[PDB]
C-alpha cells in the first residue's frame, strides 16, 4: 500500500524533473545557440528523444495502480511505439556523439571534412530512420488483451510464442547494452589515450587539471550510462532464464529499476548540455 504510493511519487518526480530539464535544454537551444555548431544538432536530438521518452511515464504510472488500460488499443500502440522508439533514438544518439568526439580528437585532418552540419543532419535522419525500423513493427504488433479482471497493453505473439518474444528481448538487450557500451568505452578510451600524448594538456600544472577534468567527465558519462542501463536489462535476462517467485520486494524492485532506466534519459541533458563549456560561455 505505502510502496505503491512511494513508487507513484517516484515516477511523478522523475517525469517532472526530466520534462523540466528537457524543456530548459530546448529553451537554450532554440533561443540562444540558434544551431551553429554540429554538436548542437546532436544535443537537440538527445533532448527531443529524452523528452518524448520521459512523456511515456504518466501513461506507464497509472497501469500499475489501476491495473487496466482504459485508453483504447490505438493509444496503447502509440505508447509502446514511443517507449521503444525514443529509447533506441537516445541510445544511438549517444553512440553517434561518441563517434563524433572520436573523429574530432583522434583523426584531426579528416575531422575538417567530416564534421559539418550537413553530415550531422543526414546522420540524424539516418538515426531516426534506424530507430523507426524497430519502432514501426513493434507499433503494428502492439495489442490489447482482456484478462479475467484487467486490461493489458501488451505485445501479441506469433507461433512459436517463446521464440519471437525471447528473440526480441535478446535483440534489444544486445543492441542496447553490448554494442553501445563497447563503442562508447573504446572510443572514449582511445580519446583519453590520444589526449594524454597532447602537449597542450600534458605539460604544466594548469593544463593538467584540465586534462583531469576531461578524464573525469568521460568517466562520469560512462559510469552513469553503465550504472543506469545495467539493472533493468539484467533483470529482464534473469526473468527470461528463470521464473522468479512473486514477492513484495521484487514488486518494488520493478519500479526502482524502471526509474533507474528513465533516470539516464533525465540526466543526459544535465550531463551533456549544461556541463559543456560553450553553454557556460552563454551565461
Amino acid at each position: 500500500m505505502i510502496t505503491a504510493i512511494t513508487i507513484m511519487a517516484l515516477y511523478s518526480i522523475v517525469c517532472v524533473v526530466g520534462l523540466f530539464g528537457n524543456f530548459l535544454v530546448m529553451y537554450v537551444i532554440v533561443r540562444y545557440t540558434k544551431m551553429k555548431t554540429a554538436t548542437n544538432i546532436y544535443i537537440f536530438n538527445l533532448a527531443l528523444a529524452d523528452a518524448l521518452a520521459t512523456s511515456t511515464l504518466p501513461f506507464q504510472s497509472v497501469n500499475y495502480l489501476m491495473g487496466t488500460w482504459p485508453f483504447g488499443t490505438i493509444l496503447c500502440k502509440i505508447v509502446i511505439s514511443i517507449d521503444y522508439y525514443n529509447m533506441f533514438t537516445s541510445i544511438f544518439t549517444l553512440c553517434t556523439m561518441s563517434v563524433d568526439r572520436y573523429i574530432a580528437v583522434c583523426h584531426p585532418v579528416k575531422a575538417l571534412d567530416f564534421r559539418t552540419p550537413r553530415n550531422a543532419k543526414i546522420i540524424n535522419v539516418c538515426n531516426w530512420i534506424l530507430s523507426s525500423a524497430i519502432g514501426l513493427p513493434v507499433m503494428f504488433m502492439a495489442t490489447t488483451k482482456y484478462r479475467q479482471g484487467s486490461i493489458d497493453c501488451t505485445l501479441t505473439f506469433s507461433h512459436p510464442t517463446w521464440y519471437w518474444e525471447n528473440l526480441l528481448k535478446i535483440c534489444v538487450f544486445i543492441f542496447a547494452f553490448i554494442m553501445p557500451v563497447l563503442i562508447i568505452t573504446v572510443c572514449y578510451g582511445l580519446m583519453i589515450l590520444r589526449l594524454k600524448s597532447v602537449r597542450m594538456l600534458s605539460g604544466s600544472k594548469e593544463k593538467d587539471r584540465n586534462l583531469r577534468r576531461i578524464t573525469r567527465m568521460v568517466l562520469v558519462v560512462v559510469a552513469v550510462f553503465i550504472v543506469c542501463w545495467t539493472p533493468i536489462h539484467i533483470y529482464v535476462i534473469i526473468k527470461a532464464l528463470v521464473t522468479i517467485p512473486e514477492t513484495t520486494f521484487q514488486t518494488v524492485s520493478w519500479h526502482f529499476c524502471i526509474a533507474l532506466g528513465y533516470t539516464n534519459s533525465c540526466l543526459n541533458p544535465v550531463l551533456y548540455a549544461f556541463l559543456d563549456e560553450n553553454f557556460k560561455r552563454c551565461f
Binding site: 506507464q60 497501469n63 505508447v79 509502446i80 517507449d83 521503444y84 529509447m87 497493453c153 501488451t154 505485445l155 534489444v172 533493468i232 533483470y235 529482464v236 520493478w254 529499476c257 524502471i258 532506466g261
Partner: peptide, 4 residues
C-alpha cells in the same frame, strides 16, 4: 522499457 521494462513496463507493459
Amino acid at each position: 522499457y521494462x513496463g507493459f
